[PDB]
Structures are given as C-alpha cells and as structure tokens.
Amino acid sequence: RRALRLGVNGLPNSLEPVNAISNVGPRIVNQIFDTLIARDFFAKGAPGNAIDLVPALAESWERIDEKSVRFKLRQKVMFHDGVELTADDVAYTFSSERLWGPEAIKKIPLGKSYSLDFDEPVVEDKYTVTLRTKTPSYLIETFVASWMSRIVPKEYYKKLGAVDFGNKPVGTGPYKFVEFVAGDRVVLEANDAYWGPKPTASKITYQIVAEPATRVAGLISGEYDIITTLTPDDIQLINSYPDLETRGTLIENFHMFTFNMNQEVFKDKKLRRALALAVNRPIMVEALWKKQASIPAGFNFPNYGETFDPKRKAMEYNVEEAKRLVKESGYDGTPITYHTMGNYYANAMPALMMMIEMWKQIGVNVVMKTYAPGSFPPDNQTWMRNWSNGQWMTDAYATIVPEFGPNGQVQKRWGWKAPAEFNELCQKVTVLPNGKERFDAYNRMRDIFEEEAPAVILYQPYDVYAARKDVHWKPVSFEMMEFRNNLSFG
Numbered sequence: 001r002r003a004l005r006l007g008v009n010g011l012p013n014s015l016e017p018v019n020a021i022s023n024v025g026p027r028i029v030n031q032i033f034d035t036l037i038a039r040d041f042f043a044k045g046a047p048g049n050a051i052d053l054v055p056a057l058a059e060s061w062e063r064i065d066e067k068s069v070r071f072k073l074r075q076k077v078m079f080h081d082g083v084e085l086t087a088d089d090v091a092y093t094f095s096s097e098r099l100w101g102p103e104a105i106k107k108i109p110l111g112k113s114y115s116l117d118f119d120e121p122v123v124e125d126k127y128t129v130t131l132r133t134k135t136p137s138y139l140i141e142t143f144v145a146s147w148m149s150r151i152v153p154k155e156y157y158k159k160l161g162a163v164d165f166g167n168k169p170v171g172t173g174p175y176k177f178v179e180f181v182a183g184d185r186v187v188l189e190a191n192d193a194y195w196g197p198k199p200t201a202s203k204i205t206y207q208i209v210a211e212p213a214t215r216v217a218g219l220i221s222g223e224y225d226i227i228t229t230l231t232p233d234d235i236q237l238i239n240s241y242p243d244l245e246t247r248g249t250l251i252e253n254f255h256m257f258t259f260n261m262n263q264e265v266f267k268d269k270k271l272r273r274a275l276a277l278a279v280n281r282p283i284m285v286e287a288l289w290k291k292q293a294s295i296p297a298g299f300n301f302p303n304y305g306e307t308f309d310p311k312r313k314a315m316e317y318n319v320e321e322a323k324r325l326v327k328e329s330g331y332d333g334t335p336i337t338y339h340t341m342g343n344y345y346a347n348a349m350p351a352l353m354m355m356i357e358m359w360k361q362i363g364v365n366v367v368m369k370t371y372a373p374g375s376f377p378p379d380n381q382t383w384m385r386n387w388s389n390g391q392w393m394t395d396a397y398a399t400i401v402p403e404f405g406p407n408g409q410v411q412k413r414w415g416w417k418a419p420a421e422f423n424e425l426c427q428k429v430t431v432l433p434n435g436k437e438r439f440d441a442y443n444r445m446r447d448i449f450e451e452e453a454p455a456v457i458l459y460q461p462y463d464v465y466a467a468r469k470d471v472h473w474k475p476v477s478f479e480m481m482e483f484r485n486n487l488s489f490g
C-alpha cells in the first residue's frame with residue numbers, strides 16, 4: 001500500500017472528536033473514530049451528496065418512544081489498543097460526566113451547547129445501549145450520525161483525561177494515531193484489524209501548508225497526493241496538467257462574518273444590519289468563486305429536509321438603507337478591526353478586501369488584522385471576525401439553535417442580546433415535532449436573525465480539492481474527507 005501525503009490549510013487544536021469540530025478536524029477524526037449510525041454519501045450512485053443513514057458501530061437501531069432509541073452494537077469490534085468496544089464505551093460518549101453535564105464544560109467547552117437535552121444513557125447488556133433525552137426529541141438519530149457522536153474508549157479516555165486524549169487519541173476507526181506535531185502535521189497509520197472497509201493507504205499525513213500557492217506548487221512537484229481548501233481560480237491551472245485534476249463540491253457549510261457584541265459599537269443591531277445590507281454577494285460570487293458558491297435565502301439550507309423553506313425570499317441588499325443606518329448609529333468614523341487567519345477559509349482575504357471597499361462606500365472604515373493558529377487574541381481585543389458553520393443535522397435545529405440559541409456561544413460568550421421572542425421559538429423547535437407550527441417558528445427565527453444581524457451569512461462555499469489522477473478519491477458534501485470504499489492507487 002501507498003502512504004497518503006496531504007497538503008492541508010490547517011490542523012485542529014485537539015484530536016478529541018468534539019473539540020476537533022472545525023473545517024480542519026473532521027478530515028482527521030473521521031479516520032480515527034466511528035459513529036453508531038453513518039451517512040452513506042455515495043448511496044444509489046450519488047456524487048458524494050446522498051443523505052442515506054447506514055449502520056456503523058450499531059448493526060441495528062430502534063426508536064422506543066418520543067425520547068429514546070435502542071442501539072444493538074456490532075460484536076467483537078476493537079479500539080486501536082486492542083480493547084473490545086461495549087455499550088459502556090457508548091454510554092460514556094453520551095454521558096453527563098464526559099459530554100452534556102455541568103462538569104464537562106472544563107473538558108469539552110461546547111459539549112452542552114452543541115448537545116440535545118440528554119438524559120443518562122441506559123446500558124442493557126455488553127452490546128445493547130439506549131440513548132435518551134429528558135424532554136421529547138426526534139433529533140436523536142441525526143445527532144448520532146453527526147461529528148458530535150464519534151465513539152471514544154471509556155477506560156483509556158478516563159485514565160488520560162480529555163486534554164491528553166486529544167494529544168494521543170484511540171478509536172475504532174480505519175486509521176490509527178501515530179503523531180501530532182502542533183502547527184505542523186498529523187500522521188495516521190492503517191488499522192488492519194478494522195471492522196468494515198479496510199484501509200487502502202499504509203499511512204496518512206496531514207501536512208500544514210498555510211499558503212494555498214505553496215500547496216498548489218507542492219502538488220505540481222509533487223510533495224502531495226491530494227491538496228485541500230482551494231478557490232475555483234486554481235481550477236484552470238491544476239487541470240492544465242494531464243496527471244492532476246480538481247475535485248470540487250458544494251458543501252453543507254456556510255461562510256460568514258460575525259461580531260463581538262460585548263463591544264459598545266456592536267451592542268445595537270443598527271451597525272451590524274448596515275454592514276449586512278452593504279454586502280454585494282452576487283459580485284463576490286462572480287469575482288472570487290467563478291459562479292460556483294451558493295447564496296442561501298437566510299439561515300435556510302436544503303439538508304434541513306422538512307425544515308428547509310424552498311419558497312423563502314433572498315437576503316436583502318440595500319446600499320441606501322446601509323448609508324441611512326450608519327448615519328443614525330453611534331459610529332463616529334473610527335476604523336473597526338476584522339480578524340482573519342490568513343486563508344484558513346478559501347477566499348477569506350480577497351472577500352474581506354472587496355467588503356472593506358463596499359463598506360468604505362457606505363461610511364464604515366474596516367481594517368484587516370491577521371492572526372496565526374493558536375494566537376487568536378482575547379475576545380476583548382476583537383470587533384469583527386470571519387467564521388463558518390457546518391449544517392451537521394438533517395434538520396433546521398443545527399446550527400441556529402446550538403450556535404445562536406440562548407445556551408450558545410454567540411449569546412453567552414459574544415454578547416448577543418437576542419430578543420426574548422427568538423429564545424422562546426428556540427425552545428419550541430427543540431421539543432415540537434415537524435408541522436406547520438415548527439416550520440413557521442423556524443422562518444420567524446430566520447426573519448429575526450436577518451433583522452438583528454448577530455452574524456452575516458456570505459455563501460455556501462464550493463469546496464475545491466486537487467489530486468493526482470492516480471489517487472482515486474471523491475469529495476463529500478461536508479467539511480470532511482471520506483476514505484472508506486473511496487481510496488485507491490494506480
């Protein structure tokens with residue numbers, strides 16, 4: 001087998017699966033770990049965008065009542081250290097101690113906020129465990145298939161502790177941990193005792209190449225088999241080589257800019273709404289994305305299924321209203337900082353460059369401030385910043401509720417004084433089953449989101465990869481790389 005050399009944009013701070021939730025963590029953690037239910041993106045010859053939920057660590061699952069699901073686990077499955085996977089390891093993954101409890105915030109900061117209203121799991125036998133919520137939740141199944149639900153070994157994780165585990169992970173996945181050099185590389189090796197589709201690569205290296213041109217030159221040489229985080233501008237050049245090609249897909253994620261609403265200037269919606277109304281998304285998509293990126297009609301995505309609004313109007317673009325709002329706002333003329341981690345997000349810097357000019361034309365002075373991975377300044381020193389949100393559920397709950405809800409970081413850490421009506425609808429959608437009431441409640445939250453502007457949605461990025469033609473791999477419609485029955489050489 002061949003060793004896989006990967007030229008990546010970045011690496012996560014940890015390899016503990018919940019703490020690795022980012023654009024850069026899931027590509028690694030998906031190799032180390034497994035979920036109970038898995039998504040089969042290639043089901044019915046789909047080009048990596050199928051929504052089909054297949055059995056993984058659980059051979060079968062059965063919803064008992066409105067607040068519980070029983071999972072019958074795959075027998076004799078082994079963790080990388082040779083320890084057999086049991087219902088005990090699954091109960092711990094979804095336990096109050098490790099995940100959703102008050103104590104777990106020290107270990108996993110976004111655990112409770114990103115979690116459902118869980119109750120302690122019920123272990124029936126070695127291969128039988130019931131996952132449950134304290135209040136009715138039909139979201140259990142979708143949470144279980146997600147990046148929040150990768151199965152950790154109870155004893156190994158408990159002995160090490162959350163932090164040390166993220167530096168030396170052990171899972172049941174197709175690839176086992178070898179090395180983690182912070183701000184440099186992650187090296188994984190083939191797990192030949194893997195249940196399910198066998199590793200086709202002997203080793204996988206995730207090499208940090210912060211500059212995309214150095215990444216493209218690295219492939220053309222070539223130091224790499226597959227390179228990540230490119231722009232549609234790179235397409236014509238990579239495809240000019242008969243041994244190389246691009247592989248792109250629209251991903252179930254959105255690029256955005258957000259605010260620190262703790263800062264006096266961003267306390268009122270007026271300036272945030274003014275900055276939102278001046279963002280010309282159609283020209284940004286032409287200039288930087290060659291028409292490949294998608295502009296959603298608010299916090300509305302097709303992956304939401306029954307909770308997606310296909311008849312929803314586009315987000316408002318109004319230059320004269322933006323001018324009028326900057327005028328009535330407290331804004332003096334003082335330049336506002338916008339923190340960016342270089343090109344961690346594809347088109348991060350060219351996008352901001354365009355927007356600074358769009359905003360200068362309405363009356364706001366915006367300045368770029370770059371930062372290095374792990375050198376993000378205290379919340380106190382930031383005003384505007386870029387971000388992204390992965391739509392990790394087959395429902396509208398994610399990410400509006402975990403990120404922007406009353407228990408999320410946008411309100412609790414970033415000072416968003418959300419209307420009481422917004423938080424009331426957040427609680428309704430969590431418990432309510434699908435219907436007219438829940439659909440309308442999501443649309444009302446979407447209307448409040450655009451009026452309050454706690455964040456400003458830019459677009460759904462077109463995720464561009466580039467690979468050697470002798471490396472057969474297909475991208476998926478998510479911020480991750482799938483190698484299971486999707487990696488071959490020759």
Ligand SMILES: O=P(O)(O)O[C@@H]1[C@@H](O)[C@@H](O)CO[C@H]1O
Nearest residue numbers: 021022023024387388389390
């Ligand atoms: O944009 P990132 O920090 O790389 O990742 C975000 C997460 O911070 C979280 O908001 C969920 O969605 C990811 O894409």
